[PDB]
Design an enzyme around this catalytic site. Structure first.
Site, mmCIF file in Angstrom:
data_model
loop_
_atom_site.group_PDB
_atom_site.id
_atom_site.type_symbol
_atom_site.label_atom_id
_atom_site.label_comp_id
_atom_site.label_asym_id
_atom_site.label_seq_id
_atom_site.Cartn_x
_atom_site.Cartn_y
_atom_site.Cartn_z
ATOM 1 N N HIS B 6 17.620 33.514 111.301
ATOM 2 C CA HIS B 6 18.207 34.675 112.093
ATOM 3 C C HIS B 6 17.416 35.919 112.111
ATOM 4 O O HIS B 6 17.584 36.683 111.220
ATOM 5 C CB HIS B 6 19.685 34.799 111.828
ATOM 6 N N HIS B 8 15.345 39.327 114.503
ATOM 7 C CA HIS B 8 14.772 39.675 115.751
ATOM 8 C C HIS B 8 13.721 40.520 115.818
ATOM 9 O O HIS B 8 13.433 41.261 114.780
ATOM 10 C CB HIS B 8 15.919 40.173 116.627
ATOM 11 N N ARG B 71 15.063 40.757 120.642
ATOM 12 C CA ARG B 71 16.166 41.610 120.330
ATOM 13 C C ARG B 71 17.384 41.149 121.468
ATOM 14 O O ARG B 71 17.008 40.885 122.571
ATOM 15 C CB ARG B 71 15.880 43.131 120.483
ATOM 16 N N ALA B 72 18.541 41.526 120.895
ATOM 17 C CA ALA B 72 19.697 41.036 121.608
ATOM 18 C C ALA B 72 19.705 41.870 123.068
ATOM 19 O O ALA B 72 20.485 41.878 123.526
ATOM 20 C CB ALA B 72 21.026 41.736 120.882
ATOM 21 N N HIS B 171 24.484 33.463 120.668
ATOM 22 C CA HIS B 171 24.456 35.038 120.540
ATOM 23 C C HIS B 171 24.516 35.714 121.861
ATOM 24 O O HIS B 171 24.114 35.338 122.926
ATOM 25 C CB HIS B 171 22.772 35.043 120.165
ATOM 26 N N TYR B 178 29.452 41.046 118.776
ATOM 27 C CA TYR B 178 28.799 39.682 118.166
ATOM 28 C C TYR B 178 29.716 38.993 117.287
ATOM 29 O O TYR B 178 30.020 37.493 117.271
ATOM 30 C CB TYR B 178 27.599 39.931 117.592
ATOM 31 N N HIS B 207 26.487 35.285 111.735
ATOM 32 C CA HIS B 207 27.353 36.067 110.931
ATOM 33 C C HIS B 207 28.566 35.525 110.209
ATOM 34 O O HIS B 207 29.564 35.803 110.073
ATOM 35 C CB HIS B 207 27.990 37.181 111.771
ATOM 36 N N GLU B 268 19.060 38.427 109.238
ATOM 37 C CA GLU B 268 18.922 39.220 110.326
ATOM 38 C C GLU B 268 18.566 40.756 109.828
ATOM 39 O O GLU B 268 19.248 41.516 110.099
ATOM 40 C CB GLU B 268 20.301 39.216 110.979
ATOM 41 N N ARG B 274 20.819 48.706 107.941
ATOM 42 C CA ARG B 274 19.409 48.869 107.153
ATOM 43 C C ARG B 274 19.630 49.431 106.012
ATOM 44 O O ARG B 274 18.494 49.821 105.451
ATOM 45 C CB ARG B 274 18.487 49.350 108.157
HETATM 46 ZN ZN LIG Z 1 21.020 38.545 116.222
#
Ligand SMILES: [Zn+2]
Ligand SMILES: [Zn+2]
Lengths: 326, 329
Positions: B6, B8, B71-72, B171, B178, B207, B268, B274
């Site tokens: 997972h 992106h 990316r989402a 996703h 999410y 997740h 992810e 972050r």
């Molecule tokens: Zn994701």
């Protein structure tokens, strides 16, 4: 004592549901719309519904008092208003017949897009006339505005005024999503800056929140918010409606004891027996009793102490009851 | 090796976002509609974005391969946007073949038959060498106006999935939408019986399964109410969860109620969270640390989560890895 803050009147006499069916049918066919005075339920029928169900299970499970509200499960405000009035009065009647075991929480006559102020009359009636100690606030009566939006402020002002908490409660597991969403909205905003006294109870152990506690701590960090302990934990509480030991253990590992309130939501969604444990999934008191993480004193906090602090009206009702019996 | 299923491409050059905004403003104003040839992203820009970010972190954290995905309007727009994003992930995989393998973004669009995504899907798998797809259960975006994953409308995709031997990560594109999507997808499968028609179909719920493991008792109990078979047989031969759970207690719960066979490593990185946890001094999303620190998992089970399960759930990935080691000894 043991206080269960999450329980619904799911065993009402069939006459209640029959009336509802007439009301619903009356929405499209006003010719079949029922009159409130047509609903008739006697105390005998009420007593029977309780003694054979909730009361019996509370006795077998070791629960002393339940904060009892109308069951969750469209028409306009008129329909919602009439229905909420009926359902709340029934919970009140149950509390009168079994004053030591049930105390009411109010269903609000919410309706999609309708200003929440319209719910104040019923809220005040339940608190002042029925002695209810909390309200069930539906965050999504249906797009619904986040709990941090000012549209909800009139309800919050009343909640602080009357000292009553709100259980965030939507009407197969949609409710788990709503719990998580409600928490996220609060973390993202600063609602408790405006209403420091405001208290929300998020059911089902906070939805997915404890399981993703690191994610939420990290998100508050990136959003430059105070630690969750100060940002939301003096205002948000979680009930123990988590139906397995591992979940309860996670809950007690990452969420402070002050923020955990005992609850089981019996005779509700899951009424089966876990073949591996041998007992009912929703007999949550067993998970608290079996916990090795919690001290004896902390378990009592979860069973009674916390609810008496989060629900000031409840603490007052209990103190008055013991004073009259003395 | 350690495979992160997972991740992106969140470090793309600003040129991408600028082009996107133009495309969006084009649906209303056709005079500002940008052309694909107008998007300028060089190999040097791609290399720099990866070397200084994803690659650097993977090295520091000890991860070897990431299944990298994007990316989402109407279909034409989504078709163009998806093709652009997938091509970029493909270019990244060509530039760093040992560290990134692509996962396809489908050009889904509300009111558009999902079968129209097959073209891009086949292209990514057959031409780009992608090993999976990201399937959005609610392309409407929070509307939930889309039919459940158990609805016949999705079968065309499942057919292609079983045929090409590729799993799909459920996703979605609010701050925690999410998490909700994960739980909903699981509930829909429990309520229905999709795997009866597609025994080999495999879904990956990110997740850590949303809120599923935390409420495992509730789901087992609901399965009972609905007279469904035990979850282990009803869905655990087709549904898997990744380890994007950002704290030790959550990972421990995941490993307490979910079989090791159903757990796949993922972090992810460089995504939603972050930051560093002040109580540990390590990054919240450095999930390998939680697996390593686990006193529940055995050395063998940990390796299963790091690579074994992914190679089983992603047959095309397993094949590519074998070919790499063979054609190069
Ligand atoms: Zn994701
Ligand atoms: Zn409830």
């Amino acid at each position: 004592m043991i206080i269960d803050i999450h329980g619904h009147y799911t065993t009402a006499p069939k006459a209640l549901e029959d009336w509802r069916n007439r009301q619903i049918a009356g929405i499209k066919d006003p010719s079949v719309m029922p009159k409130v005075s047509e609903l008739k339920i006697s105390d005998d029928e009420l007593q029977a519904s309780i003694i054979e169900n909730q009361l019996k299970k509370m006795q077998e499970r070791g629960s002393d008092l339940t904060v009892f509200s109308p069951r969750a499960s469209i028409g306009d405000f008129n329909v919602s208003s009439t229905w909420a009035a009926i359902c709340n009065e029934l919970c009140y009647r149950v509390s009168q017949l079994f004053p030591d075991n049930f105390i009411g929480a109010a269903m609000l006559p919410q309706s999609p897009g309708v200003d929440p102020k319209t719910c104040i009359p019923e809220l005040e009636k339940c608190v002042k006339e029925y002695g209810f100690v909390a309200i069930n606030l539906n965050p999504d009566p249906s797009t619904s505005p986040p709990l941090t939006d000012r549209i909800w402020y009139p309800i919050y002002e009343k909640m602080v005024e009357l000292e009553i908490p709100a259980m965030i409660h939507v009407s197969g597991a949609h409710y788990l999503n709503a719990d998580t969403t409600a928490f996220m909205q609060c973390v993202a905003g600063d609602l408790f800056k405006d209403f420091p006294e405001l208290k929300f109870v998020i059911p089902h152990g906070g939805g997915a929140v404890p399981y993703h506690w690191g994610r939420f701590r990290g998100l508050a960090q990136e959003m430059k918010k105070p630690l969750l302990e100060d940002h939301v934990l003096n205002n948000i509480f979680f009930d123990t409606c988590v139906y397995h030991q591992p979940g309860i253990d996670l809950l007690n590992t990452v969420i402070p004891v002050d923020n955990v309130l005992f609850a089981s939501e019996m005779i509700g969604a899951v009424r089966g027996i876990d073949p591996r444990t041998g007992f009912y999934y929703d007999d949550t008191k067993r998970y608290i009793e079996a916990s090795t993480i919690l001290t004896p004193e902390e378990k009592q906090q979860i069973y009674e102490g916390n609810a008496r602090r989060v629900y000031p009206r409840l603490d007052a009702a209990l103190k008055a009851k013991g004073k009259l019996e003395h």
